[PDB]
Design a protein around this ligand. Structure first.
Ligand SMILES: Nc1nc2c(c(=O)[nH]1)N(C=O)[C@@H](CNc1ccc(C(=O)N[C@@H](CCC(=O)O)C(=O)O)cc1)CN2
Ligand SMILES: Nc1nc2c(c(=O)[nH]1)N(C=O)[C@@H](CNc1ccc(C(=O)N[C@@H](CCC(=O)O)C(=O)O)cc1)CN2
Ligand SMILES: Cc1ncc(COP(=O)(O)O)c(CNCC(=O)O)c1O
Ligand SMILES: Cc1ncc(COP(=O)(O)O)c(CNCC(=O)O)c1O
Ligand SMILES: Cc1ncc(COP(=O)(O)O)c(CNCC(=O)O)c1O
Ligand SMILES: Cc1ncc(COP(=O)(O)O)c(CNCC(=O)O)c1O
Lengths: 470, 472, 472, 472
C-alpha cells in the first residue's frame, strides 16, 4: 500500500526531513550572523523564494510560448511571456529592437548557449583574461596552457588583458590582438573588474576585425537595470547575464539579442535585419537544454518586476556608494586596490604588497564569519594574490556607507591578525595553520562580527520565525 | 531612499506580485483538476518544494565539499554530502564502488558533462535513435541529416534503432554497427522506450568494441531505486539521471560513476582502477557549470530520503501496474501500442493506423484537460506532427490512483481519440480545417466536464487544495 | 673556387655518382629479368621518361595557366594546358561538362585535395573498407579502431564492406549505412577489388542521402580510357586518379570535376550550375601544395597522348584478357580467388585455406624474381602478414605477354606457392624457422632460373636492354 | 593488335610527342636566354636529371628500407638508405642524434607531414607571417581573416611578425605572443626573409612556452650544408626542407628529426629519449602519402653527394657574395631593400617608395626576360599586386656569374624599374592604362635584346647547349 498523499506529499519539511530542515535553519543563521562580501552573492526576496519553491517545478514546457512540445502550458506560457516582457522593460529595451530568452538554467549555461548559437566548434573567441578580471566562461585556459573552461575546449580562446600599470583594460592591445587573431566573437564584461567598460571602443574593435560583440553583464546587471553604469545594449549584439547577483533574483540566466533592421554598414546589403533570435532559441533548446525550470522563470519574473522599481534604483545607487566608501577606507589604511578604486559593486584588493596570499586572508576571514573569496589578480598563474569584496549582499540588508566603513575596519582587523599569525608561525601553510587554533583574537573578532551582523534586517525569511536565534 | 527590507524583502508573493501569484494559483488548479499523463512529469512533495524555495538559493559554493573556491560553506557542504550519500543509498550502491556528482542543473547538463568528462570533441557515441525512443542528448540528428542536439555537433553520433516490426531494440544491428563505427561511448536508457533494457548484452557489445557504457535512467530512475526494473549499475561504467521524473524530486541531474578496482579484463593491467571521479567532477565544474544550485541539491536530498521509504517502493510497483492496466484497456479497444504493452511507467501509442497525428490528439486532449504529449514513433520525421502519443503513469499515481482509476483514464482517452476522429471525419485532415471543429464542440465540453469531475476525486501533493485561490 | 658548370653540371650520372648509377643499372636488370606482378606497377615509355628527366624540373609555376604567381611561364603554361586538354580527351569528356586539375603530386595528394575542396574538417565520408579492397585514402582505420590514414583523422570515416561470402560489394548494406550515417561524400573505386562497379547504384545511394559521389579510378584508369570497363564519369561528381598504374604514365595525380548546368533534381534551383572548379583548384594550390612538378606534368601529357592511341586500347583489352586467363589457371588448381575471378586487371588470392600468409608467399616469390605484394583479404587484421596476395597484369602485358604467357606465370606462381607450403611443412610456420628453409634451396634456384629465362624472351619499354650495364 | 614494345615504349620523345618535345626545347632556350632571379629556383645538374628521368619511376616501395609493403625492393632500399645517409652527412649530423625521412613529395608535403606527426587537429602553431617573409605552410591566413593554407584549416595558426620599422624579426613580440597563445609548435625559417635566424632565442622562447621548435630551411638549405649560415640543427627538434632551391637538387622534401637522449630538462625525467622517428615516418606513410617517388629519391641522393663537395661550398659562398653585391648596387641607386641588405641568397626590394606595385615590375621584367616574382612586403594584403619584388642569386650563380655580373644584373633591374616608372608617368597607374605601355615599346624591346645578349653567353647546367634545338 502506498503512503496517503497527505503523509508523503503534504507534510512539511520540518517533519519529513528534520536533518535537511535543521541544516537549512543553520545556514539561515549563518547568513544572518556574518559579513557576507562575496561580490557574486545577494539575499533575494521572500516573494522570489515563494515562486521558486512552487508547483511550477512540476511542468514540462519545452519550446517557446505558443509553440511547445507538450500539452498543458496555458499558464506556463503566460508566465514565460511576462518574464520576457519584464526583462526587456527592466533594461529599457524596445521590443522591436531586442528580444530575450529566459530559459538558461544559470549563467554558464547562458553563455555556452549564446556561443553555440553564433559559433561553430573551434571558432575563435576573445574575452577578458581570468587574472585580469574575466570569467571562466570567457575562454579561460591557464598561463601554463591548461584548458579549464569548456569555452576553451569547444572553441578557440585568446584572452585580452589589463594594462599592468593602471589595471584597466588596455584597449590598444585588445585591438592589436583582435586584428592578429581575428576572433569571430569578442566578449566584454567580467567577474572581478572594478571599472566600467568602454563599449563604444569594443564596438570599434569588433567592427575593425569583423567580430560579433557580446557583453556578459552578470555581475553588474542590477546596476545596468538601474542605469547606474554604462549600458552594453547601446553597442553589443548579444548581452548575457545571470539573475542572482546584483539583480537580486533567483539563480538563472538570460540571453538578450538584437532584432529588426541592422544599422548601416559598408558592404552589408540594404534593409538587412538581425538574425539572432532563432539561432539563440535553438541553441538553448533543443540544442543544449531540455525542459525549462519554470519555478526559476516565475521567480525571475518576480525579481524583474522588483528591479524596475524606484526602491531598486536607490538600492543600486547605494551598492555603488557602499563599495566606494569601503574602498576609500581600505586605501586610507594603505592597502592596494586594483585600479585604485571602483566604479561598480566590488573592489579587488591586491594582497601581495603585504606578503599575503588570498587563501590566508580568506581562510582567516571565514573563521571570523567574514565571507570573501580569494581572487586572482594580474600576474597570478593558479592561493592567488588578491581578495575580492562586494557590496550587494550587505547593502540588501540595509547597510549604508558608515556601516561599510565598519566592514572596512573589520577587514583591517582581519588582515592585521593574518599578518601577526604569519609573522609568528610562518608563511608556509603547515606552519600558518597552527596560528588558527585557539586564537583568542580570532574568537574576539568572530564575536564582534557576529554582534555587528545579527542586528541588521534580513530579506527572504522572517528572523522571528527561524529555529536558531542565538 | 531604499525600501525597508521588510517591504521589498519579506512581503509575501501575493502582495509583491499579484500577477505572478495569480498565474501560479491558476497553474495549481490546472494540475489537480485535469488528468496529467506526460510520462516525464510528476507531482513532487511539499517537503521537496519547501527546500527548493529556501535561503539555500543565496549561496555560491563552487568546488566540492571541503574543497571550495569560496568561504562560508560549513552547512552547504553537509547538505551536499548528505545528498550524495543518500543518492548512493537510494540506488543500493557501495561507496567503495560508486560515486556520484549531484551538481548538474538538469538532465541535459548531466549528460553533456558526463560526455565531456570521458570524450574529446568529435569522439564517437552511439545511443538509441530518437524515433526509436532515445533522448535528444543521446546524439540526435534527423533522418535528413540535420544535427539537432549539441551531442551530435560536439561529438560524432551514430544512433542504433529498434526492430521496425517488433519495436524492440535490435541488439544484433547494435553490435554490427558498433563493430563498424567503433564508438568511444555507448549510451542506453531512453525517453519513450516501453520495455526494459538488456544491460548484460550492452556490456558484451561495449567490451567487443572497447567502448565505455553509460545508462541514462532519467525516466525510470524511481523504478530503479525501488528495484522494480533492471539495475544498470550492474553493467554500466556511468549512470546519469534526472531527479524530477519517476524519482519524484526537484528538477536536477546526477552522474553516478564507478570507483575502485576494475573487474578482470583481457590484456588489462593488474591492479587497474577506475579513473572517472576526477574527470566527471572537473567536467561539471570548472569546465561546464558555475555555482551549484544549492536549493535544488537540498531539495534533492529530501527527495532521495523519500525515495528510500517503503511507501515509495509501493508507489513504483503501482506506477508499473497502472501503466500495464491502462495499456490493457487501450489494446482492448483495438489501439496500437509500440511493442504491444509495457514493462515500465509509460505506453507509446501509435496513432497512424487511425489516420491521426499526435498533434491532433494532443490538441483535443488539452482542450479536455487531458495533458499528454505528441511523440515520435518509428519512422517519424515530423516533430510538429509525429505519429504517436506517449502516456505515462507516475504523475497520476502520485495522486493515489490505482488500476481501476487508470482504466477510467483509458476510457477518457478512448473518448478523446473517438472525438478526434469524428472531428477529422467532418472537417478534414488539414490543420486549418480541423481547428474549426474545436469551436463550440459540445462533446469536447462534456468530456472536459467529466475529466474535471473525475480529477477532483483525488488528493494532491505539493500544496493544500483546501488553501488554493481557485477552488472547486 | 666554384667547379666549372661543365664539371658539376653537364657531366653524366655515370661519372658524377657511380654508386647511384650502378644501383639504377641493377634496378633496370631486375625489372626486365623477372616477372613483375604488382597490380599498381607498370613500365612506362622512354618518351615519358625523357620528359620526366628534363629542364622542366627547374621551373616554379604556382597558380594556373594564365594566372601564375611567378613570371617566365610562357611555355610551362602551354605544357599544362596541353596536359589538361589531353586528359579530357583521353577519357572522352566534353570541356563544357568536365574540367581537370593535373598538378597533384601523386594519388594520395589528389584525394586529400579533392576532399579538402568539398569537405570541412570532420565531415563524413564513406569508402570501401581496406580489407574489402579500398585504398588507404578512402578513410582507412582498422577493425581495432586505430586511425591509419589521415583521411580517417581529418574526416569522419565509415567504410562499407563486401559480402563476406561472395566478395562482391554489399550494395544493400551500403545504402542502409549511408542512410544512417549521412555522409557528405561517398567514395567508390579501389585498390584490390577484382570486379567492376555499379556506379548507377552508387548514384542512387548518393542521391538518397544527399551525398557527393567520387570515384577513385587510379588502378583501372587505363581501362577506363580504353572504354574497357564502366565509366565513372556518367554518374560521379568528381573522379580522381593516379597516372602510373594501368594508365602507364609518370607518377602523378589528376582530379576531374563536373562543370556547367546540374541535372534536374527535386528542390534544386532552376539553372543551378556546378561549383567544383574553383574549390578544387584552390585546394590543390594554395591550400595544400606548392610549386607544380612541371616535369611530371610534361611527362603526363606524353602518357595521355599515348593513352588515346589505337595501340593503347589493344593493350587494355589484353590486360583484361591476361588477368582472366591467369585467374582461370589458378582456380583450376584449386586456389581461392576473391569473387572467383576478375573483371579488371588483377586477381586477389586468399592463401588462408592453405594455412599460408601473404608475407611468406611474397618473400619466397621475391627470391625467385617473382614480384608480388602481400595483401589484405576480408577479415584480415595484420598488415605485416595478411592472408592474401594480389596479382596484376599491366606490367607484364606492357612487355607484350599474352594469355598463354600468363598461363606460364600461373604455373610459376603455383610452383612458388607449393614451395612455400613445402618449406613451412618442413621448417615450421614461425618466421624464424621458415626463413631457415630459404637458404640454399635447390627448388628456389630452379624456379628462379626458369623465371629469368622466361623473362628474357620479351622486350622491355623505357630503356634499351642492349645498352644496359648488367647484360644476360 | 598491340604496338610493338619498341614503337610505343623505346621510341624517343622527339618522335613520340613532337609537340611536348618542342615545348621543352623552347623552355630550355628560355632558361638560357633570360636572367632568372626567382629566389626559389635553381638549375640542377644533368646527373640529377638522369636519375630523375629513369626506370626508378616504375617501382612501388611503400614502407621503409627493409620493411616494405611490396616485393622487389632489393635495390630501391639501397638507394633510399644511401639518400638518407648522404642527407645526414651533407648537414654534418651524427646519425645517433639525427634521422631523416626522404620520402616527402615536395616542401609543402614535408611540412604538413611533420605537423601531422606531432600535432592533433586544431593544435596551435606559430610561424612567420607571410607578409613578414614566412611561407604559406607556416599557417597563412590573411589579415582579413581568410584561411588560405591548409595549415590554418587543420591547425590553429597565430603568425608572428617582423618589427614594423627595422624589418627584423621582433623577438620580444614573438615571446609575448607565444606565452599568450601557447602554441604546441613554433616554426622558424622563411621564404622572403633576408637575414639569418637567432635559433638560440627561438629555443629560449619554445622552452618558455612549452613548444616544439621546427625550422623550415627550404630556401637556405644549400647555405646550411655549406656551413655559410647559422645551423638550425643546433637548437631545433625538427628541420624540414625542400631539395630544389639553394640545395640545387630535384624537387622533393626531407624531414630531419632528433633521435637519442634528450638534453637535461627539469620536469623531464632522467634517461629520456626523443620519440620523433616513428611518428614522423608514420605521418609520411601511411598517414598522408602513398608510394615514394623513387626517381626523386635517387636524384636527391645524387644532389646530396654533390652538395657535400668543396665546389658546392664555394658555390654557397658565391651565392651570398652575389646577393650582397646586387643589394649594394641597388641601394647605391637609392632603392629600398628590406633590412637594408642581406645575409643569405636573396634581397627583398620594397617598391612602394617609388609608387610601384610588384605586379608592374614583375610584368615589365618578364617582357624583358628578367624573371622575378612580385612579393608581399610588410603590411601588404593584395596577392595580385603586392608592394615588393624578391630577387634571388642561386640560379644565375649556378651559371657561373660572379659579383661583377650581379652588378650588371643590378643595372638591368635599374633599367627595368626606370622604364616601369616612365610607363607609369606616361600611360598611367591603372592596369588598363599601364598595359598600353607594354605594347610596341621600343625601350622594352631594347632592354630585352640586351638581357638576352648578356644571358645567352653564360654556361648552362642540366643539358648540352650544343645539342639544343633552339640555339638562337
Ligand atoms: N523518443 C523521444 N521522445 C520525446 C523526447 C526525446 O528526447 N526522445 N523529448 C525530450 O524532450 C520530447 C520531444 N523533443 C523533441 C525536440 C525537438 C525535436 C526536433 O526534431 N526538432 C527539429 C524540428 C522542429 C520542427 O519541425 O518544427 C528542430 O528543432 O529544428 C524532436 C523532439 C518529448 N518526447
Ligand atoms: N585493399 C588495399 N590493398 C593494398 C593497399 C590499400 O590501400 N588497399 N595499399 C596501398 O598502398 C598497399 C597496402 N598498404 C597498407 C599500408 C598500411 C597498412 C596498415 O594497416 N599499417 C598499420 C599496421 C602496421 C603493422 O602492423 O606492422 C600501421 O602502419 O600502423 C595496411 C596496408 C598494397 N595493397
Ligand atoms: C532519458 C532522458 N534523459 C535526459 C532528459 C533531459 O532532462 P532535462 O529535460 O531536465 O534536461 C530527458 C528529458 N525527457 C523529457 C521527456 O521525455 O519528455 C530524458 O527523457
Ligand atoms: C561574469 C560572469 N558570468 C557568468 C557567471 C556564471 O554564473 P553561474 O555560476 O550561474 O553559472 C559568472 C559567475 N561568477 C561567479 C563569481 O564571480 O563568483 C560571472 O561572474
Ligand atoms: C620556406 C619554404 N618552405 C616550403 C616551401 C614549399 O616547397 P614546395 O613548393 O616544393 O611545396 C617553400 C616554397 N617557396 C616557394 C617560393 O618561395 O617561391 C618555401 O619557401
Ligand atoms: C585506388 C588508389 N587510389 C590512390 C592510390 C594512391 O596513389 P599514390 O601511391 O601515388 O599516392 C592508390 C595506390 N595504391 C597502390 C597499390 O594499390 O599498390 C590506389 O590504389
Amino acid at each position: 500500500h502506498m503512503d496517503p498523499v497527505s503523509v508523503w506529499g503534504n507534510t512539511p519539511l520540518a517533519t519529513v526531513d528534520p536533518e535537511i530542515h535543521d541544516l537549512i535553519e543553520k545556514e539561515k543563521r549563518r547568513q544572518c550572523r556574518g559579513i557576507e562580501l562575496i561580490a557574486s552573492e545577494n539575499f533575494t526576496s521572500f516573494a522570489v523564494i515563494e515562486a521558486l519553491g512552487s508547483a511550477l517545478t512540476n511542468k514540462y514546457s519545452e519550446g517557446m510560448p505558443g509553440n511547445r512540445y507538450y500539452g498543458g502550458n496555458e499558464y506556463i506560457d503566460q508566465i514565460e511571456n511576462l518574464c520576457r516582457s519584464r526583462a526587456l522593460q527592466a533594461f529599457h529595451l524596445d521590443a522591436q529592437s531586442w528580444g530575450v530568452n529566459v530559459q538558461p538554467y544559470s549563467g554558464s549555461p547562458a553563455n555556452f548557449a549564446a556561443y553555440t548559437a553564433v559559433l561553430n566548434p573551434h571558432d575563435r573567441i576573445m574575452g577578458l583574461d581570468l587574472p585580469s578580471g574575466g570569467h571562466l566562461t570567457h575562454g579561460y585556459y591557464t598561463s601554463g596552457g591548461k584548458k579549464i573552461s569548456a569555452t576553451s575546449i569547444y572553441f578557440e580562446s585568446l584572452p585580452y588583458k589589463v594594462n599592468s600599470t593602471t589595471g584597466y583594460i588596455d584597449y590598444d592591445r585588445l585591438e592589436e590582438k583582435a586584428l592578429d587573431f581575428r576572433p569571430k566573437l569578442i566578449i566584454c564584461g567580467g567577474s572581478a573588474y572594478p571599472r566600467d567598460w568602454d563599449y563604444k571602443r569594443f564596438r570599434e574593435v569588433a567592427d575593425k576585425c569583423g567580430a560579433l560583440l557580446l557583453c556578459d553583464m552578470a555581475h553588474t546587471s542590477g546596476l545596468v537595470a538601474a542605469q547606474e553604469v554604462n549600458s552594453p545594449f547601446e553597442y553589443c549584439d548579444i548581452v548575457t547575464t545571470t539573475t542572482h547577483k546584483s539583480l537580486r533574483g533567483p539563480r538563472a540566466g538570460m540571453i538578450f539579442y538584437r532584432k529588426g533592421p541592422k544599422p548601416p554598414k559598408k558592404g552589408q546589403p540594404e534593409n538587412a535585419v538581425y538574425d539572432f533570435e532563432d539561432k539563440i532559441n535553438f541553441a538553448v533548446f533543443p540544442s543544449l537544454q531540455g525542459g525549462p525550470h519554470n519555478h526559476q522563470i516565475g521567480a525571475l519574473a518576480v525579481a524583474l518586476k522588483q528591479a524596475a522599481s524606484p526602491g531598486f534604483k536607490a538600492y543600486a545607487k547605494q551598492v555603488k556608494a557602499n563599495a566606494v566608501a569601503l574602498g576609500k577606507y581600505l586605501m586610507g589604511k594603505g592597502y592596494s586596490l586594483v585600479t585604485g578604486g571602483t566604479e561598480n559593486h566590488l573592489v579587488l584588493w591586491d594582497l601581495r604588497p603585504l606578503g599575503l596570499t588570498g587563501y590566508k586572508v580568506e581562510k582567516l576571514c571565514d573563521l571570523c564569519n567574514i565571507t570573501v573569496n580569494k581572487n586572482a589578480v594580474f600576474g597570478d598563474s593558479s592561493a592567488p594574490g588578491g581578495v575580492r569584496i562586494g557590496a550587494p549582499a550587505m547593502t540588501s540588508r540595509g547597510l549604508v556607507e558608515k556601516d561599510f566603513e565598519q566592514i572596512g575596519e573589520f577587514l583591517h582587523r582581519a588582515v592585521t591578525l593574518t599578518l601577526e599569525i604569519q609573522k609568528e608561525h610562518g608563511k608556509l601553510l603547515k606552519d600558518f595553520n597552527k596560528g588558527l587554533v585557539n586564537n583568542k583574537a580570532i574568537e574576539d573578532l568572530k564575536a564582534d562580527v557576529e554582534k555587528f551582523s545579527a542586528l541588521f534586517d534580513m530579506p527572504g525569511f522572517l528572523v522571528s520565525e527561524m529555529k536558531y536565534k542565538d
